[PDB]
Amino acid sequence: PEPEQVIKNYTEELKVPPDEDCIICMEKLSTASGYSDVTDSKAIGSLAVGHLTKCSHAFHLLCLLAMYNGNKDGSLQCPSCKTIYGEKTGTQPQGKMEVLRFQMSLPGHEDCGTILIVYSIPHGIQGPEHPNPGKPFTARGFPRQCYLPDNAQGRKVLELLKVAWKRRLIFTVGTSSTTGETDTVVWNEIHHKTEMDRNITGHGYPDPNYLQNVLAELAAQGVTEDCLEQQ
Ligand SMILES: [Zn+2]
Ligand SMILES: [Zn+2]
């Protein structure tokens, strides 16, 4: 889990670095890391070069370490091909997700029924992964209802949302964009629809771009169609 440990976990030493540049610092792999002056490590020197263990893209290991300036969730993303090593997870506190389906249609989706997701997160105590470990956090507005059309795309989004939920990515502990309350349970860059009819609050359905948008948001957090498949 330690920052030097995860880089070794996802890399293999390149005995002879071929004649090429490291896309993180632009210095050739056969020469020193361009970030050696800034980044210090215990077991990684300026000349250490290695490749990621699925895509074989090569970098200075110190460059990759300086990159892993991020969440420190044990995950690492190739800057070249964006292949994700490990699994991005988040700080969603404990709670409950329930899924229902009814026949009534959402506006703009009169050809199908509706998926209803209900989330509930109780108040609690922040853990070491949270902004103020050991301090309380609050949780407003629960249970929260969210809506998806019960068509092929909405059913796919639902399956991905369940994965994001299990990865603690749906909610985080942060500052409410609406009340300014700090240390509270808020959304985490995966936008949900919380009303059926957008004309009441200005938020809801129809929204032709919504499903495409949320798939992209899920993918940016490493939740993809490939995550649904099992050998
Ligand atoms: Zn480099
Ligand atoms: Zn790669």
Swiss-Prot record:
It is found in: Cytoplasm; Nucleus. A zinc finger (RING-type) spans 22-82. It comes from the Eukaryota. Regulator of Notch signaling, a signaling pathway involved in cell-cell communications that regulates a broad spectrum of cell-fate determinations. Probably acts both as a positive and negative regulator of Notch, depending on the developmental and cell context. Mediates the antineural activity of Notch, possibly by inhibiting the transcriptional activation mediated by MATCH1. Functions as a ubiquitin ligase protein in vitro, suggesting that it may regulate the Notch pathway via some ubiquitin ligase activity. Homodimer. May form a heterodimer with other members of the Deltex family. Interacts with NOTCH1. The WWE domains are thought to mediate some protein-protein interaction, and are frequently found in ubiquitin ligases. Belongs to the Deltex family. This is Probable E3 ubiquitin-protein ligase DTX2. It comes from Homo sapiens. The gene is DTX2. The chain holds residues 391 to 622 of 622 of the full protein.
